[PDB]
Amino acid sequence: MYWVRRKTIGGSGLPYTENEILEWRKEGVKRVLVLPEDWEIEESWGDKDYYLSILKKNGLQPLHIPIPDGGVPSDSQFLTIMKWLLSEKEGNLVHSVGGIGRTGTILASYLILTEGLEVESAIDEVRLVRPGAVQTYEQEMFLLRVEGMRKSWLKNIY
């Protein structure tokens, strides 16, 4: 697990055991944005709802927003994601399977909108703690698209 903005917003891959969730708690994680698709979660845990219930059982508030591996969120999902991440400032954890592609993309987009950074700077900030963040052309194109419509996005988010 890594913090992009200390105790405010960080990223991670898909945990394998509950003990890893306890470590998240020790680091200050309070809320979790789950990005992998059902099958990806089932692949590791055996059942998607069981995994989500386990996050709740251990005192974390989860939101499941399924994004295809190597892909990006739809506009509807992104609005939902940004409102979720902004509704509660501290302890936000975003995770995918590897904690590099979808996670890096969301975290970078977050910085683009909240800190007014260019795509290059946003990815730079994420790669400082998570090397290789943002993997695909579509993910890169999504970020450029978000930067180009920052005003429109901020307008809809706030």
Binding site: G13, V97, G101
Partner: peptide, 5 residues
Amino acid sequence: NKYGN
């Protein structure tokens, strides 16, 4: 995707 470095 393609994880495991």
